[PDB]
Amino acid sequence: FHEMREPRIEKVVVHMGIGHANAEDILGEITGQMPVRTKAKRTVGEFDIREGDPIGAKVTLRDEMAEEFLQTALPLAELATSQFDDTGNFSFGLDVTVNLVRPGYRVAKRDKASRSIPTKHRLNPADAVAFIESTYDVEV
RNA sequence: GUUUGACUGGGGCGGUACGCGCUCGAAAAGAUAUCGAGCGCGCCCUAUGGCUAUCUCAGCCGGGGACCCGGCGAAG
Ligand SMILES: [Mg+2]
Ligand SMILES: [Mg+2]
Ligand SMILES: [Mg+2]
Ligand SMILES: [Mg+2]
Numbered sequence: 001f002h003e004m005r006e007p008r009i010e011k012v013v014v015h016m017g018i019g020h021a022n023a024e025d026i027l028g029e030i031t032g033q034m035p036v037r038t039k040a041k042r043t044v045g046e047f048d049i050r051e052g053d054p055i056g057a058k059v060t061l062r063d064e065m066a067e068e069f070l071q072t073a074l075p076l077a078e079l080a081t082s083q084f085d086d087t088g089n090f091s092f093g094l095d096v097t098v099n100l101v102r103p104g105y106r107v108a109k110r111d112k113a114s115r116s117i118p119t120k121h122r123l124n125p126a127d128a129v130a131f132i133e134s135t136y137d138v139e140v
Numbered sequence: 141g142u143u144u145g146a147c148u149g150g151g152g153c154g155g156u157a158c159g160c161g162c163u164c165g166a167a168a169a170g171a172u173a174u175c176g177a178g179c180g181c182g183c184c185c186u187a188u189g190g191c192u193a194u195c196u197c198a199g200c201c202g203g204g205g206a207c208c209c210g211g212c213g214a215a216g
């Protein structure tokens with residue numbers, strides 16, 4: 001049963017929602033791979049009327065690139081609880097989000113016969129705290 | 141020397157139902173009138189055309205009315 005039910009980290013998105021950049025540079029070094037532009041939608045008063053327009057960057061890290069990052073990111077954060085997803089996710093911080101899920105996720109991300117992951121096989125906030133807390137730190 | 145139009149609950153004044161498109165009137169095929177009700181067109185676009193690749197939207201919810209992540213979401 002287990003082994004295929006035990007949590008794992010799938011991508012950690014580090015993004016800097018600026019309002020118009022030079023910031024990529026640090027993201028590249030804090031993570032280890034190129035950043036991606038962040039265009040914005042809708043015209044608004046914060047002199048942000050431009051639809052297509054660089055207004056920040058993000059970086060999606062997977063596997064080791066994500067651990068080797070969290071092995072310093074987490075330590076720089078304290079928070080826990082309430083600040084967790086209903087799907088077992090949590091964002092802290094410059095933002096650093098951690099998407100967590102179990103082994104059969106590809107079923108909902110592939111092209112052919114894709115399917116949505118059953119509520120039971122989903123990751124709960126609690127089942128999430130456990131996994132992570134059980135990895136160099138403490139909850140709440 | 142001539143012209144100075146037509147429609148019109150008489151004619152004039154007002155209006156254009158004088159060329160066009162849609163809903164209703166219209167009676168569950170088609171056709172269908174009034175100065176019938178609601179309202180539009182006389183353009184604009186080198187992309188706002190064409191194809192291919194990749195992709196899924198509104199709105200709401202939860203975590204850090206811009207941006208980022210997850211979820212619900214046949215279509216508003
Ligand atoms: Mg004569
Ligand atoms: Mg005369
Ligand atoms: Mg007459
Ligand atoms: Mg008919």
Ligand code: NA
Pocket residue numbers: 145
């Ligand atoms: Na005439």
